[PDB]
Design a protein around this ligand. Sequence first.
Ligand SMILES: *[C@@H]1O[C@H](CO)[C@@H](O)[C@H](O)[C@H]1NC(C)=O
Ligand SMILES: [Ca+2]
Lengths: 321, 247
Amino acid sequence: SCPSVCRCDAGFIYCNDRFLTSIPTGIPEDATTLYLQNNQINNAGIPSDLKNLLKVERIYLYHNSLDEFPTNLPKYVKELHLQENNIRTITYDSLSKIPYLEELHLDDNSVSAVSIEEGAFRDSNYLRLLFLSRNHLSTIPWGLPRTIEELRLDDNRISTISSPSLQGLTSLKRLVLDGNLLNNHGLGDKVFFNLVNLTELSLVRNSLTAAPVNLPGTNLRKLYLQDNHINRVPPNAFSYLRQLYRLDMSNNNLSNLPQGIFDDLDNITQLILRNNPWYCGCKMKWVRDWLQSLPVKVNVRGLMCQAPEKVRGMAIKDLNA
Amino acid sequence: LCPGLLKGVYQSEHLFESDHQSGAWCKDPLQASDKIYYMPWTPYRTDTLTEYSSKDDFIAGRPTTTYKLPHRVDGTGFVVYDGALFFNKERTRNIVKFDLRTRIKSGEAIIANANYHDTSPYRWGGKSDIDLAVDENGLWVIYATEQNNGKIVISQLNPYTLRIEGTWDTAYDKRSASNAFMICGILYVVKSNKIDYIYNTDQSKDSLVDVPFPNSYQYIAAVDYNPRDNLLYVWNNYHVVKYSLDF
Ligand SMILES: *[C@@H]1O[C@H](CO)[C@@H](O)[C@H](O)[C@H]1NC(C)=O
Ligand SMILES: [Ca+2]
């Protein structure tokens, strides 16, 4: 029941790694999972009859010649892997052929800011996972489905973020924004505020010069802010983040902390503060007292004096004056 | 020094129950140390290794340090060998050589024609498409090629030059394997239940076997052999345990 070139075994059709420019037409109707990666397949090699495989639930098509978003896919596909492809335009039509899509990976493609037809996602209402790692996005799309639960936008050129882009994504749980070009003015007022179910916020390797305020503390457990160039921390940045049990701020330019910002971090467990230029003045004395009052449960790293030179390298909780 | 031909595998220790169902753990069998390295499995999110100073401090959850890997890892096939970690970079058939002391990747190697990313993982999946193994003969790579029809294929790999130094085609399907490990150039295929297949590379010959393997819990995530104390380091459904071996 299988083509000559590919090899099929109990629902699993192996057509991967065969120099395929086109998809075989003679396909088992009882198909379940498809392997078509590492071929030369572009958008014209998709038959119209492919649509009628009502039992196909996972499709792997990474590393092909898809030079835009594919049509004629099995109506009931739940997992789609389109990475390492040359994808540019994304139409409403294309996504609407698979509204029962649950999980989407678009790593290593050439998708940009406006490259998505506005309102394309208005139909895919099962879409829960979204991977835009390594694309060409200069901003964040507005018409994203509420059903989105994860969002990876790592290694793009994201510099600016409007509020109603992320508002409406209450199902959003993890928000990954590594390697983007984000500054505090590039941030929305209360753009993160409405993500009630947000759990992780990862903003590693950006250009932030201050700790962001108006963060949702309803479910935030882990907050990542490493590899930034942060000077200040606004007194209300960690307010109400009482479920925050993890927070990382390594490699920043932080010298001093304003008084009583961690009063609200009740459920904190791990606080990593490595590679920071800590000055130990009268402004820093409040920390020392706070460290000693701390339950033994919570671990803290990278909290040592670099300034003054006299007490450089020395642990802050041990000093007199 | 070859311990002998395997006669039986039995549970020995139960360290604790982790909060992740899948993952892997082992030691550096070529280092005289009590260092334990620990990597829990989360798909598309795995890029770290936590180092522990001792067995007691491991159970207490008292880590020595954490290693941030240059790439993601696919499956629970990682291995530590002579102060250097080896793992499978996500969505690729590339094994990454990672020097733990200087904390730099010192190289990389492509495992020719390997199926990857849940194309031929183990039974339980989790991108187990590539599993690394250490024995008396050196460093190995266990995978499945599309030419060998998804059935287990083993190659001997130079840990310092990352060259493939020989290949053997077996007859056991990798999707069937619950895991696998190497001893004295002898392959041990687990089904879960049983070791129901072995491959002796010295002879380029295989044989069907029937050695018991503890079904203590169902989700056998990882199985890695150790030539130093001659043990199995197994992760089975949230549980961190050791198996003893009968020779
Ligand atoms: C958060 O997740 C829960 C899952 O039980 C869901 O019922 C709820 O609608 C989500 N949003 C909010 C705001 O609770
Ligand atoms: Ca193994």
